[PDB]
């Protein structure tokens, strides 16, 4: 049974660590279950204010600094945005290069999230010291694919390093970990903790390779610098020797996703099967990514190979089209001035007004994005449900696979465990597609190396750039007036997920997902972290 | 059990790109660094503990008998008593001040902590400042948006093993920031011959002509990008794009419009 105390009263977790940015979580607890929740973003920077009056060509360089974890994606969204405002259609090669860089970002970002951000909620690193490395090796050999890094000898060296570190008395990033001394909510056998810790360390090295692959096309990582209005600047990105090295690196990364990430994720899922019943929401949104036709936002929506759509009330039989006119943002419960509710992002307003800490009337620097009055979860889970529902063949195959492995029904995916599994599922799918996408661009680049189209700056226009970033549906919205930025609004995946209540008082996805969370130990409320982290929160992104 | 020097790493008004850049180090890799070289005692992005447990971990490090070095990522928002940027219910300016008071040394990772960065750009709604300005203390600046891990790790290791490296007038170690991007750029011969790309679609751009007419700020930017590269493979001008000047103080306002020289 799922451990749960009798605690009644408030719990505040600030800072939420192992995310990007500054998040405070307040909950009211009754008999060891969360009964109310608030998601309180604690930093404003105000990029939208800063962009006013500047050169539309500059937008991407500022907005990329919304966040360096999901680096690139804002430069991409801003470029798609200005591209739409100037009505330029990017060349085939630019579409491919921009989409390949997104794919590389998915691999980097998801790998780092699972291991370095999320795993410490499920893996008791210190318990790994209790494992017999020989028993751990046999365990790994029985479940996962065969590999030298899973041998007794490799696992023992990992355990030896960890033991010397722990005995030094300087626990560093493990100081005061919720798992120290044991914890009822941590279920993994010690052998599994050891295996996962080994891969955690490995993944620290492998994420370097994932970023190198990305940088071949992107110029550098973090903060790529290869995109321009009308396409891309990186002609060398189309030539043979770099793409061969790009392929070779992505293959190493994908071998690690398949040998370690997916098997670890499935092991965790197997042991924490009860988390398939906690942390569910009902509505899902995606703008789609990996389009075959990125000539306009309409075409992106229609031709995204990871499809776009809207699911409402968990109804997988009715995927609606995205209505970009129906998106708006409220600020009723946010730190912005009165009269800013119900704004479509073309009419967006960003007028900061702070009140005070834990004011239930105004408690976040995130706006509250709503779709026809409903909150929307975005991200890997949203994409997975939308893709599955529409019969996308890869998503149907891998999902049904995961479901069969775990012996759970598809309804168990509406949960924190689901949200976590979805992130792996789509990583595996990006991996399976890499070689075809790389080949497409290599073949295209050799025949004709056009990469940027000509374009003219209009006096007055508007545009929107859409992407499905690793955390979900991202949109940038520009109004151009006098050839300058008149208004520039970001609506970001973590804004959808972790914003506060909207104008009708309605909880955001993370706030709703938190209701019903069991708390085994109110001193060490890891269950709050499991649900928050499964959203892969980014407050830098969410507030900008 | 040799004692490893204590490092406290604070996140203020940042985007996390500096923390990301740091973990791309390969000499050493980040695991070797935190297991053998330093004791990274507070770091919000990766630490296990959260909430009060994380705050207590911070206070344990600040009270450590052996002292500690302070790494700061991000600028400090100072409007409204610093309340627009808070951790554990405390203004970032208050906590950074407290942590700086007893630090053996302060390393500002990134242009934000060094000079104020993106949120300081006009009209600066959060009245953000660089750390030296907000605290009135001397910092070792490792700027760029983000800096190369080679520059950050090299500075950390230099400070722990030798001492303060020689700094230029903007507080940047001369080991990494002593030379203009432009002086080491492979397209310098094109610059000298006045062979410029007039646009990104031009045949000139395809031939790898100089990017000066497209806004390249390499001639006024001190960094080691073309020499050391990023991620062992590339740098922005090699990827056909102009340098934005991102290791220069206040570049958001001094180097813009990025695609122009005006
Ligand atoms: S210097 Fe640039 S990359 Fe570092 S925190 Fe500031 S905005 Fe992000
Ligand atoms: S591309 Fe930039 S750094 Fe290189 S030679 Fe031209 S102006 Fe100098
Ligand atoms: N992925 C990502 Fe960052 C967030 N939320 C963006 O966009
Ligand atoms: S933009 Fe920055 S990373 Fe180097 S090339 Fe220019 S200084
Ligand atoms: Mg302790
Ligand atoms: Mg916004
Ligand atoms: Ni982000």
mmCIF file of N, CA and C in Angstrom, chain A residues 329-436:
data_model
loop_
_atom_site.group_PDB
_atom_site.id
_atom_site.type_symbol
_atom_site.label_atom_id
_atom_site.label_comp_id
_atom_site.label_asym_id
_atom_site.label_seq_id
_atom_site.Cartn_x
_atom_site.Cartn_y
_atom_site.Cartn_z
ATOM 1 N N UNK A 329 -4.554 34.623 -21.774
ATOM 2 C CA UNK A 329 -3.905 34.568 -20.478
ATOM 3 C C UNK A 329 -4.619 35.452 -19.466
ATOM 4 N N UNK A 330 -4.863 34.901 -18.277
ATOM 5 C CA UNK A 330 -5.406 35.643 -17.137
ATOM 6 C C UNK A 330 -4.296 36.049 -16.177
ATOM 7 N N UNK A 331 -4.554 37.056 -15.343
ATOM 8 C CA UNK A 331 -3.568 37.470 -14.338
ATOM 9 C C UNK A 331 -4.238 37.675 -12.990
ATOM 10 N N UNK A 332 -5.472 37.199 -12.868
ATOM 11 C CA UNK A 332 -6.268 37.480 -11.677
ATOM 12 C C UNK A 332 -5.470 37.076 -10.439
ATOM 13 N N UNK A 333 -4.855 35.899 -10.480
ATOM 14 C CA UNK A 333 -4.122 35.394 -9.339
ATOM 15 C C UNK A 333 -2.619 35.593 -9.508
ATOM 16 N N UNK A 334 -2.226 36.399 -10.485
ATOM 17 C CA UNK A 334 -0.818 36.685 -10.705
ATOM 18 C C UNK A 334 -0.427 38.075 -10.246
ATOM 19 N N UNK A 335 0.881 38.280 -10.179
ATOM 20 C CA UNK A 335 1.436 39.577 -9.804
ATOM 21 C C UNK A 335 1.499 40.549 -10.999
ATOM 22 N N UNK A 336 0.349 40.868 -11.573
ATOM 23 C CA UNK A 336 0.276 41.865 -12.635
ATOM 24 C C UNK A 336 -0.879 42.791 -12.294
ATOM 25 N N UNK A 337 -0.953 43.945 -12.955
ATOM 26 C CA UNK A 337 -1.974 44.997 -12.627
ATOM 27 C C UNK A 337 -3.408 44.550 -12.894
ATOM 28 N N UNK A 338 -4.418 45.267 -12.327
ATOM 29 C CA UNK A 338 -5.785 44.861 -12.631
ATOM 30 C C UNK A 338 -6.102 45.099 -14.097
ATOM 31 N N UNK A 339 -7.107 44.380 -14.604
ATOM 32 C CA UNK A 339 -7.611 44.608 -15.950
ATOM 33 C C UNK A 339 -6.811 43.940 -17.046
ATOM 34 N N UNK A 340 -6.031 42.927 -16.684
ATOM 35 C CA UNK A 340 -5.233 42.212 -17.658
ATOM 36 C C UNK A 340 -5.730 40.814 -18.018
ATOM 37 N N UNK A 341 -6.918 40.444 -17.537
ATOM 38 C CA UNK A 341 -7.502 39.113 -17.740
ATOM 39 C C UNK A 341 -8.018 38.927 -19.167
ATOM 40 N N UNK A 342 -8.062 37.678 -19.620
ATOM 41 C CA UNK A 342 -8.679 37.329 -20.902
ATOM 42 C C UNK A 342 -7.987 37.874 -22.142
ATOM 43 N N UNK A 343 -6.680 38.105 -22.060
ATOM 44 C CA UNK A 343 -5.949 38.707 -23.179
ATOM 45 C C UNK A 343 -5.425 37.657 -24.139
ATOM 46 N N UNK A 344 -5.895 37.678 -25.390
ATOM 47 C CA UNK A 344 -5.187 36.925 -26.435
ATOM 48 C C UNK A 344 -3.726 37.440 -26.532
ATOM 49 N N UNK A 345 -2.747 36.561 -26.791
ATOM 50 C CA UNK A 345 -1.349 37.029 -26.760
ATOM 51 C C UNK A 345 -0.969 38.152 -27.754
ATOM 52 N N UNK A 346 -1.678 38.293 -28.869
ATOM 53 C CA UNK A 346 -1.493 39.478 -29.720
ATOM 54 C C UNK A 346 -1.832 40.793 -29.003
ATOM 55 N N UNK A 347 -2.726 40.725 -28.013
ATOM 56 C CA UNK A 347 -3.130 41.871 -27.192
ATOM 57 C C UNK A 347 -2.561 41.758 -25.771
ATOM 58 N N UNK A 348 -1.502 40.973 -25.621
ATOM 59 C CA UNK A 348 -0.975 40.655 -24.304
ATOM 60 C C UNK A 348 -0.508 41.895 -23.568
ATOM 61 N N UNK A 349 -0.632 41.876 -22.239
ATOM 62 C CA UNK A 349 -0.146 42.972 -21.391
ATOM 63 C C UNK A 349 0.703 42.432 -20.261
ATOM 64 N N UNK A 350 1.837 43.080 -20.001
ATOM 65 C CA UNK A 350 2.742 42.624 -18.950
ATOM 66 C C UNK A 350 3.115 43.788 -18.062
ATOM 67 N N UNK A 351 2.256 44.031 -17.065
ATOM 68 C CA UNK A 351 2.358 45.174 -16.190
ATOM 69 C C UNK A 351 2.558 44.654 -14.749
ATOM 70 N N UNK A 352 3.819 44.423 -14.350
ATOM 71 C CA UNK A 352 4.076 43.767 -13.049
ATOM 72 C C UNK A 352 3.575 44.535 -11.839
ATOM 73 N N UNK A 353 2.961 43.826 -10.896
ATOM 74 C CA UNK A 353 2.495 44.441 -9.661
ATOM 75 C C UNK A 353 2.567 43.351 -8.601
ATOM 76 N N UNK A 354 3.594 43.451 -7.767
ATOM 77 C CA UNK A 354 3.812 42.542 -6.646
ATOM 78 C C UNK A 354 2.944 42.921 -5.467
ATOM 79 N N UNK A 355 2.595 41.935 -4.635
ATOM 80 C CA UNK A 355 1.803 42.264 -3.410
ATOM 81 C C UNK A 355 2.568 41.813 -2.177
ATOM 82 N N UNK A 356 2.564 40.516 -1.909
ATOM 83 C CA UNK A 356 3.358 39.980 -0.828
ATOM 84 C C UNK A 356 3.271 38.504 -0.884
ATOM 85 N N UNK A 357 4.223 37.893 -0.192
ATOM 86 C CA UNK A 357 4.406 36.451 -0.134
ATOM 87 C C UNK A 357 3.151 35.745 0.359
ATOM 88 N N UNK A 358 2.818 34.681 -0.360
ATOM 89 C CA UNK A 358 1.649 33.841 -0.055
ATOM 90 C C UNK A 358 0.310 34.567 0.056
ATOM 91 N N UNK A 359 0.153 35.654 -0.695
ATOM 92 C CA UNK A 359 -1.153 36.331 -0.833
ATOM 93 C C UNK A 359 -1.989 35.366 -1.687
ATOM 94 N N UNK A 360 -3.017 34.738 -1.115
ATOM 95 C CA UNK A 360 -3.867 33.826 -1.904
ATOM 96 C C UNK A 360 -4.586 34.508 -3.082
ATOM 97 N N UNK A 361 -4.730 35.836 -3.042
ATOM 98 C CA UNK A 361 -5.335 36.580 -4.163
ATOM 99 C C UNK A 361 -4.356 36.838 -5.340
ATOM 100 N N UNK A 362 -3.055 36.860 -5.054
ATOM 101 C CA UNK A 362 -1.997 37.128 -6.057
ATOM 102 C C UNK A 362 -0.760 36.378 -5.606
ATOM 103 N N UNK A 363 -0.452 35.252 -6.239
ATOM 104 C CA UNK A 363 0.647 34.416 -5.706
ATOM 105 C C UNK A 363 1.650 33.883 -6.716
ATOM 106 N N UNK A 364 1.667 34.402 -7.937
ATOM 107 C CA UNK A 364 2.655 33.926 -8.915
ATOM 108 C C UNK A 364 2.995 35.003 -9.935
ATOM 109 N N UNK A 365 4.216 34.915 -10.427
ATOM 110 C CA UNK A 365 4.709 35.767 -11.499
ATOM 111 C C UNK A 365 4.343 35.169 -12.851
ATOM 112 N N UNK A 366 3.917 33.898 -12.869
ATOM 113 C CA UNK A 366 3.350 33.327 -14.099
ATOM 114 C C UNK A 366 1.940 33.862 -14.294
ATOM 115 N N UNK A 367 1.624 34.177 -15.541
ATOM 116 C CA UNK A 367 0.250 34.393 -15.982
ATOM 117 C C UNK A 367 -0.433 33.023 -16.007
ATOM 118 N N UNK A 368 -1.751 33.013 -16.162
ATOM 119 C CA UNK A 368 -2.525 31.770 -16.245
ATOM 120 C C UNK A 368 -3.113 31.593 -17.670
ATOM 121 N N UNK A 369 -2.439 30.791 -18.520
ATOM 122 C CA UNK A 369 -2.969 30.563 -19.883
ATOM 123 C C UNK A 369 -4.130 29.599 -19.858
ATOM 124 N N UNK A 370 -5.186 29.914 -20.605
ATOM 125 C CA UNK A 370 -6.410 29.142 -20.630
ATOM 126 C C UNK A 370 -6.855 28.993 -22.076
ATOM 127 N N UNK A 371 -7.550 27.905 -22.343
ATOM 128 C CA UNK A 371 -7.987 27.593 -23.682
ATOM 129 C C UNK A 371 -9.482 27.449 -23.557
ATOM 130 N N UNK A 372 -10.231 28.454 -24.017
ATOM 131 C CA UNK A 372 -11.698 28.433 -23.924
ATOM 132 C C UNK A 372 -12.167 28.283 -22.473
ATOM 133 N N UNK A 373 -11.370 28.793 -21.548
ATOM 134 C CA UNK A 373 -11.740 28.712 -20.142
ATOM 135 C C UNK A 373 -11.165 27.504 -19.419
ATOM 136 N N UNK A 374 -10.498 26.607 -20.143
ATOM 137 C CA UNK A 374 -9.925 25.410 -19.515
ATOM 138 C C UNK A 374 -8.409 25.473 -19.443
ATOM 139 N N UNK A 375 -7.856 24.931 -18.359
ATOM 140 C CA UNK A 375 -6.428 24.782 -18.209
ATOM 141 C C UNK A 375 -6.019 23.633 -19.096
ATOM 142 N N UNK A 376 -4.782 23.657 -19.581
ATOM 143 C CA UNK A 376 -4.311 22.616 -20.458
ATOM 144 C C UNK A 376 -2.944 22.105 -19.993
ATOM 145 N N UNK A 377 -2.807 20.798 -19.817
ATOM 146 C CA UNK A 377 -1.463 20.202 -19.647
ATOM 147 C C UNK A 377 -0.769 20.067 -21.005
ATOM 148 N N UNK A 378 0.519 20.419 -21.053
ATOM 149 C CA UNK A 378 1.295 20.343 -22.260
ATOM 150 C C UNK A 378 2.544 19.521 -21.989
ATOM 151 N N UNK A 379 3.179 19.016 -23.040
ATOM 152 C CA UNK A 379 4.400 18.252 -22.811
ATOM 153 C C UNK A 379 4.365 16.832 -23.348
ATOM 154 N N UNK A 380 5.307 15.998 -22.901
ATOM 155 C CA UNK A 380 5.401 14.636 -23.457
ATOM 156 C C UNK A 380 4.115 13.832 -23.324
ATOM 157 N N UNK A 381 3.490 13.849 -22.154
ATOM 158 C CA UNK A 381 2.193 13.189 -21.961
ATOM 159 C C UNK A 381 1.095 13.699 -22.906
ATOM 160 N N UNK A 382 0.928 15.022 -23.018
ATOM 161 C CA UNK A 382 -0.030 15.589 -23.975
ATOM 162 C C UNK A 382 0.258 15.089 -25.400
ATOM 163 N N UNK A 383 1.510 15.181 -25.844
ATOM 164 C CA UNK A 383 1.864 14.719 -27.168
ATOM 165 C C UNK A 383 1.564 13.242 -27.313
ATOM 166 N N UNK A 384 1.879 12.462 -26.284
ATOM 167 C CA UNK A 384 1.744 11.010 -26.393
ATOM 168 C C UNK A 384 0.260 10.643 -26.540
ATOM 169 N N UNK A 385 -0.611 11.286 -25.759
ATOM 170 C CA UNK A 385 -2.041 10.971 -25.816
ATOM 171 C C UNK A 385 -2.605 11.392 -27.191
ATOM 172 N N UNK A 386 -2.217 12.575 -27.651
ATOM 173 C CA UNK A 386 -2.693 13.106 -28.922
ATOM 174 C C UNK A 386 -2.200 12.209 -30.068
ATOM 175 N N UNK A 387 -0.924 11.844 -30.051
ATOM 176 C CA UNK A 387 -0.384 10.949 -31.072
ATOM 177 C C UNK A 387 -1.057 9.573 -31.042
ATOM 178 N N UNK A 388 -1.151 8.973 -29.857
ATOM 179 C CA UNK A 388 -1.828 7.687 -29.692
ATOM 180 C C UNK A 388 -3.269 7.734 -30.215
ATOM 181 N N UNK A 389 -4.009 8.755 -29.801
ATOM 182 C CA UNK A 389 -5.413 8.912 -30.148
ATOM 183 C C UNK A 389 -5.608 8.993 -31.651
ATOM 184 N N UNK A 390 -4.663 9.632 -32.330
ATOM 185 C CA UNK A 390 -4.740 9.770 -33.774
ATOM 186 C C UNK A 390 -4.101 8.594 -34.507
ATOM 187 N N UNK A 391 -3.564 7.623 -33.776
ATOM 188 C CA UNK A 391 -3.050 6.424 -34.451
ATOM 189 C C UNK A 391 -1.694 6.596 -35.135
ATOM 190 N N UNK A 392 -0.914 7.587 -34.693
ATOM 191 C CA UNK A 392 0.476 7.734 -35.093
ATOM 192 C C UNK A 392 1.202 6.399 -34.786
ATOM 193 N N UNK A 393 1.760 5.761 -35.821
ATOM 194 C CA UNK A 393 2.175 4.338 -35.748
ATOM 195 C C UNK A 393 3.279 4.076 -34.719
ATOM 196 N N UNK A 394 4.270 4.965 -34.641
ATOM 197 C CA UNK A 394 5.329 4.858 -33.634
ATOM 198 C C UNK A 394 4.796 5.023 -32.211
ATOM 199 N N UNK A 395 3.966 6.042 -32.004
ATOM 200 C CA UNK A 395 3.384 6.248 -30.700
ATOM 201 C C UNK A 395 2.441 5.132 -30.291
ATOM 202 N N UNK A 396 1.605 4.643 -31.205
ATOM 203 C CA UNK A 396 0.791 3.467 -30.908
ATOM 204 C C UNK A 396 1.659 2.223 -30.547
ATOM 205 N N UNK A 397 2.707 1.939 -31.334
ATOM 206 C CA UNK A 397 3.612 0.796 -31.064
ATOM 207 C C UNK A 397 4.280 0.891 -29.671
ATOM 208 N N UNK A 398 4.943 2.010 -29.373
ATOM 209 C CA UNK A 398 5.764 2.102 -28.153
ATOM 210 C C UNK A 398 4.860 2.191 -26.922
ATOM 211 N N UNK A 399 3.788 2.978 -27.009
ATOM 212 C CA UNK A 399 2.813 3.022 -25.915
ATOM 213 C C UNK A 399 2.238 1.635 -25.540
ATOM 214 N N UNK A 400 1.658 0.943 -26.512
ATOM 215 C CA UNK A 400 1.076 -0.367 -26.270
ATOM 216 C C UNK A 400 2.125 -1.328 -25.725
ATOM 217 N N UNK A 401 3.358 -1.138 -26.189
ATOM 218 C CA UNK A 401 4.525 -1.876 -25.696
ATOM 219 C C UNK A 401 4.664 -1.622 -24.176
ATOM 220 N N UNK A 402 4.764 -0.347 -23.810
ATOM 221 C CA UNK A 402 5.026 0.036 -22.431
ATOM 222 C C UNK A 402 3.911 -0.477 -21.568
ATOM 223 N N UNK A 403 2.684 -0.330 -22.065
ATOM 224 C CA UNK A 403 1.506 -0.786 -21.348
ATOM 225 C C UNK A 403 1.506 -2.293 -21.136
ATOM 226 N N UNK A 404 1.965 -3.030 -22.134
ATOM 227 C CA UNK A 404 2.009 -4.484 -22.027
ATOM 228 C C UNK A 404 3.109 -4.946 -21.082
ATOM 229 N N UNK A 405 4.259 -4.270 -21.121
ATOM 230 C CA UNK A 405 5.394 -4.576 -20.240
ATOM 231 C C UNK A 405 5.006 -4.433 -18.774
ATOM 232 N N UNK A 406 4.273 -3.355 -18.506
ATOM 233 C CA UNK A 406 3.873 -2.970 -17.178
ATOM 234 C C UNK A 406 2.577 -3.636 -16.718
ATOM 235 N N UNK A 407 1.849 -4.234 -17.663
ATOM 236 C CA UNK A 407 0.499 -4.792 -17.439
ATOM 237 C C UNK A 407 -0.447 -3.763 -16.848
ATOM 238 N N UNK A 408 -0.418 -2.547 -17.366
ATOM 239 C CA UNK A 408 -1.397 -1.557 -16.933
ATOM 240 C C UNK A 408 -2.234 -1.110 -18.128
ATOM 241 N N UNK A 409 -3.476 -0.665 -17.869
ATOM 242 C CA UNK A 409 -4.316 -0.136 -18.955
ATOM 243 C C UNK A 409 -3.885 1.263 -19.365
ATOM 244 N N UNK A 410 -4.320 1.693 -20.549
ATOM 245 C CA UNK A 410 -3.949 3.009 -21.072
ATOM 246 C C UNK A 410 -4.404 4.175 -20.174
ATOM 247 N N UNK A 411 -5.458 3.950 -19.383
ATOM 248 C CA UNK A 411 -5.942 4.943 -18.392
ATOM 249 C C UNK A 411 -4.965 5.221 -17.234
ATOM 250 N N UNK A 412 -4.038 4.287 -16.978
ATOM 251 C CA UNK A 412 -3.031 4.520 -15.941
ATOM 252 C C UNK A 412 -2.030 5.592 -16.376
ATOM 253 N N UNK A 413 -2.048 5.943 -17.662
ATOM 254 C CA UNK A 413 -1.132 6.954 -18.170
ATOM 255 C C UNK A 413 -1.530 8.361 -17.749
ATOM 256 N N UNK A 414 -2.790 8.555 -17.352
ATOM 257 C CA UNK A 414 -3.212 9.860 -16.810
ATOM 258 C C UNK A 414 -2.767 9.951 -15.361
ATOM 259 N N UNK A 415 -1.480 10.200 -15.141
ATOM 260 C CA UNK A 415 -0.900 10.117 -13.807
ATOM 261 C C UNK A 415 0.503 10.651 -13.857
ATOM 262 N N UNK A 416 1.084 10.810 -12.686
ATOM 263 C CA UNK A 416 2.463 11.211 -12.582
ATOM 264 C C UNK A 416 3.363 10.138 -13.210
ATOM 265 N N UNK A 417 3.027 8.868 -12.997
ATOM 266 C CA UNK A 417 3.850 7.808 -13.544
ATOM 267 C C UNK A 417 3.747 7.879 -15.071
ATOM 268 N N UNK A 418 2.526 8.085 -15.576
ATOM 269 C CA UNK A 418 2.290 8.256 -17.005
ATOM 270 C C UNK A 418 3.088 9.384 -17.620
ATOM 271 N N UNK A 419 3.064 10.523 -16.940
ATOM 272 C CA UNK A 419 3.736 11.718 -17.374
ATOM 273 C C UNK A 419 5.240 11.450 -17.489
ATOM 274 N N UNK A 420 5.753 10.693 -16.528
ATOM 275 C CA UNK A 420 7.164 10.337 -16.504
ATOM 276 C C UNK A 420 7.481 9.358 -17.636
ATOM 277 N N UNK A 421 6.641 8.356 -17.800
ATOM 278 C CA UNK A 421 6.850 7.345 -18.856
ATOM 279 C C UNK A 421 6.751 7.960 -20.262
ATOM 280 N N UNK A 422 5.803 8.874 -20.469
ATOM 281 C CA UNK A 422 5.638 9.553 -21.742
ATOM 282 C C UNK A 422 6.912 10.239 -22.219
ATOM 283 N N UNK A 423 7.688 10.776 -21.285
ATOM 284 C CA UNK A 423 8.908 11.492 -21.597
ATOM 285 C C UNK A 423 9.912 10.517 -22.218
ATOM 286 N N UNK A 424 10.012 9.325 -21.644
ATOM 287 C CA UNK A 424 10.877 8.269 -22.213
ATOM 288 C C UNK A 424 10.369 7.769 -23.558
ATOM 289 N N UNK A 425 9.059 7.557 -23.623
ATOM 290 C CA UNK A 425 8.422 7.027 -24.834
ATOM 291 C C UNK A 425 8.791 7.887 -26.051
ATOM 292 N N UNK A 426 8.597 9.200 -25.948
ATOM 293 C CA UNK A 426 8.937 10.094 -27.059
ATOM 294 C C UNK A 426 10.425 10.231 -27.320
ATOM 295 N N UNK A 427 11.252 10.136 -26.285
ATOM 296 C CA UNK A 427 12.714 10.064 -26.526
ATOM 297 C C UNK A 427 13.079 8.863 -27.428
ATOM 298 N N UNK A 428 12.530 7.710 -27.118
ATOM 299 C CA UNK A 428 12.778 6.500 -27.918
ATOM 300 C C UNK A 428 12.336 6.689 -29.381
ATOM 301 N N UNK A 429 11.231 7.401 -29.551
ATOM 302 C CA UNK A 429 10.702 7.668 -30.879
ATOM 303 C C UNK A 429 11.567 8.672 -31.660
ATOM 304 N N UNK A 430 12.040 9.725 -30.991
ATOM 305 C CA UNK A 430 12.952 10.692 -31.622
ATOM 306 C C UNK A 430 14.175 9.878 -32.080
ATOM 307 N N UNK A 431 14.684 9.041 -31.179
ATOM 308 C CA UNK A 431 15.854 8.213 -31.514
ATOM 309 C C UNK A 431 15.687 7.360 -32.743
ATOM 310 N N UNK A 432 14.518 6.721 -32.879
ATOM 311 C CA UNK A 432 14.231 5.855 -34.016
ATOM 312 C C UNK A 432 14.127 6.622 -35.327
ATOM 313 N N UNK A 433 13.849 7.924 -35.241
ATOM 314 C CA UNK A 433 13.682 8.762 -36.423
ATOM 315 C C UNK A 433 14.942 9.496 -36.882
ATOM 316 N N UNK A 434 15.977 9.510 -36.038
ATOM 317 C CA UNK A 434 17.131 10.395 -36.254
ATOM 318 C C UNK A 434 17.810 10.124 -37.578
ATOM 319 N N UNK A 435 18.061 8.846 -37.837
ATOM 320 C CA UNK A 435 18.787 8.450 -39.020
ATOM 321 C C UNK A 435 18.058 8.836 -40.310
ATOM 322 N N UNK A 436 16.754 8.607 -40.373
ATOM 323 C CA UNK A 436 15.959 9.020 -41.534
ATOM 324 C C UNK A 436 16.004 10.555 -41.723
#
